[PDB]
Design a protein around this ligand. Structure first.
Ligand SMILES: [Mg+2]
Lengths: 100, 469
DNA sequence: CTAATAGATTAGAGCCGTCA
RNA sequence: UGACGGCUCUAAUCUAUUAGU
């Protein structure tokens, strides 16, 4: 709700990490900045702190715009005969001939 | 060289007003929505059932991990997630001697023994409910494996009570509807899979790598059955009502007598997703016909419209009727005759008997999820099952088969239809999964129709899902 | 109405896998 | 009946034709 002007003058010129749209990508940025600036992290819990660190940086995964081509199991019929015909065998074939 | 279009994930909302995409991650980062205080439990069964249930409750108070933490996010413990107390202190055992259970399950008539077992259990549960000052929220029924195995219609043993089912679950859930006790049926082999093994020294149900998933789903179901709201939708718009419609055969009856049920989902103007069944079983006396008569069609539509109006005060701007069947003309005319002027009725058919399989050319992984092939202005294919790039895997094992969606009646946009259908797959409170393969408006209606079909002594059944699922 | 030929269209039940 | 997905096996019911009506 507060704009750029209303920010405290002592902090507006500093780089700011954004939590406006979520608290998770903000935490991702926090961990990036801390590991870049060499903050003394003392990992005391093993196989837990690493897993929680990994849970962020992967919650925001999405798709990339790359062209993809797929096959299928549909075969398109190409050609058809030009005439469907109804021949007239008026009592000229057996009544129980089993045409099939 | 046809073209595919991709649809983004809908996102689901949690505490603190935080939106995520996976339910598991959003329960372990911000927790559930509503604030309970703790779950008091009731247990009915044998001594071993109480032992197993106590063991499992004590086990799930600590964090549980899986083998792969990307595909299946960890379980950090019950209270660390759900912000409530559920331990082996608010239990109220009701011992059932194994003598009666063993004695009943030898009568060689499946209906008789099913009736006897259900009566034996529900008498104790109802007596506990009515005549005692103890307050118990979810009644957990621990059932031995042999009871579950021998409670099928096609089961073998190695008139008054024939108007029922041959299944323990359906009869048990139906016969307790008029008293409204939220119950949860567990099997012995489910809560303690270590003991129940085969002639190889190994468990029949191997949960070694998926213990966290079992804990997640059990805890989520317990949280939901005890007045808990774990999450809700994010961008389902106002003025729209979503309806399900499923047909169920009543089987054991003189007439074929097909029955029909429904579900209802909408926004309540308080940002809450109202989601409940709207069912009084409507019957079609004709065999093999899956269409309502005009009278029952009018009755159902009137009931849904009246429920929406009494909930909010204004009739819906748009109404969507989802189903697996195709309407005829008389049914839809009956629908239209009792419809207001400022309301749009759109019917959609979701089918799965249409073979169209797409294969990636090079890799060993299947197609992305949100891909959809639009056929016409009233017909398309949607892939609700496929590769999710966030969990580094897919929702199936073999090559999936997409849903076929057609706008059967009305005027609407197919893209919005597929978007709403994809958003309607993030509501399976019976599970804790990334998403569903079919919309939830068509699965809970199925459960209600299967529950309230085994019994014919039921009138004005409730609407809340907590007494069916 | 019942007996066959099909195409198209719905339900009900049972079995197996889930890992790396 | 802690979930979900993929298969297989079974009855039905319509529509068009023909003979028993
Ligand atoms: Mg359940």
């Amino acid at each position: 709700q507060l704009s750029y002007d209303d920010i405290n003058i002592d902090i507006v010129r500093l780089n700011a990490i954004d939590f406006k749209m979520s608290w998770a990508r903000g935490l991702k940025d926090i961990l990036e900045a801390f590991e870049k600036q060499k903050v003394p992290k003392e990992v005391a819990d093993a196989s837990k702190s690493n897993l929680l660190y990994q849970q962020i940086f992967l919650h925001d995964k999405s798709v990339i715009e790359k062209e993809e081509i797929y096959d299928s199991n549909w075969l398109s019929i190409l050609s058809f005969p030009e005439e469907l015909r109804f021949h007239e065998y008026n009592w000229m074939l057996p009544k129980r001939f089993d045409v099939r | 060289m046809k073209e595919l279009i991709y649809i983004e994930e809908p996102k689901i909302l949690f505490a603190h007003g935080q939106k995520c995409t996976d339910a598991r991650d959003g329960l372990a980062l911000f927790g559930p929505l509503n604030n309970l205080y703790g779950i008091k439990s009731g247990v009915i069964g044998t001594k071993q059932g109480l032992k197993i249930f106590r063991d499992y409750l004590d086990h799930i108070q600590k964090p549980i991990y899986n083998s792969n933490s990307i595909t299946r996010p960890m379980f950090p413990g019950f209270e660390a997630v759900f912000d409530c107390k559920w331990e082996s202190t608010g239990i109220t055992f009701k011992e059932v001697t194994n003598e009666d259970i063993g004695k009943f399950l030898y009568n060689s008539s499946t209906h008789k023994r099913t009736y006897d077992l259900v009566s034996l259990f529900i008498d104790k549960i109802i007596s506990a409910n009515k005549n005692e000052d103890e307050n118990v929220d979810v009644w957990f029924v621990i059932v031995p494996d042999e009871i579950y195995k021998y409670c099928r219609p096609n089961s073998v043993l190695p008139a008054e009570t024939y108007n029922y089912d041959a299944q323990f679950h359906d009869q048990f859930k139906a016969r307790l509807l008029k008293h409204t006790i939220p119950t949860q049926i567990f099997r012995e082999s489910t809560l303690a899979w270590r003991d129940f093994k085969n002639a190889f020294g190994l468990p029949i149900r191997d949960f070694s790598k998926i213990e966290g998933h079992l804990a997640w789903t059990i805890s989520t179901a317990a949280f939901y059955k005890a007045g808990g709201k774990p999450w809700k939708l994010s961008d389902v718009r106002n003025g729209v009502c979503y309806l399900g419609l499923v047909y169920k055969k009543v089987e054991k009856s003189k007439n074929p007598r097909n029955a029909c049920c429904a579900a209802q989902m909408f926004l309540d103007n308080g940002d809450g997703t109202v989601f409940k069944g709207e069912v009084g079983p409507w019957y079609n006396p004709k065999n093999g016909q899956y269409h309502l008569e005009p009278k029952e069609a009018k009755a159902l539509l009137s009931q849904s419209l009246q429920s929406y109006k009494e909930q909010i005060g204004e009739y819906p701007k748009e109404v969507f009727i989802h189903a697996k069947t195709r309407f005829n003309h008389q049914e839809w005319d009956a629908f239209l005759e009792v419809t207001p002027k400022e309301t749009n009725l759109v019917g959609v058919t979701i089918s799965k008997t249409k073979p169209l399989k797409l294969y990636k050319t090079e890799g060993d992984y299947t197609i992305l999820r949100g891909n959809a092939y639009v056929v016409n202005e009233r017909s398309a294919f949607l892939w609700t099952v496929g590769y999710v790039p966030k969990i580094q895997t897919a929702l199936s094992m073999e090559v999936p088969n997409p849903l076929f969606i057609e706008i059967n009646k009305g005027e609407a946009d197919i893209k919005q239809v597929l978007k709403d259908i994809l958003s309607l797959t993030k509501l399976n409170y019976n599970a804790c999964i990334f998403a569903d393969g079919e919309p939830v408006t068509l699965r809970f209606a199925d459960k209600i129709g299967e529950i309230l079909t085994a019994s014919t002594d039921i009138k004005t059944p409730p609407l809340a899902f907590k007494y069916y699922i």
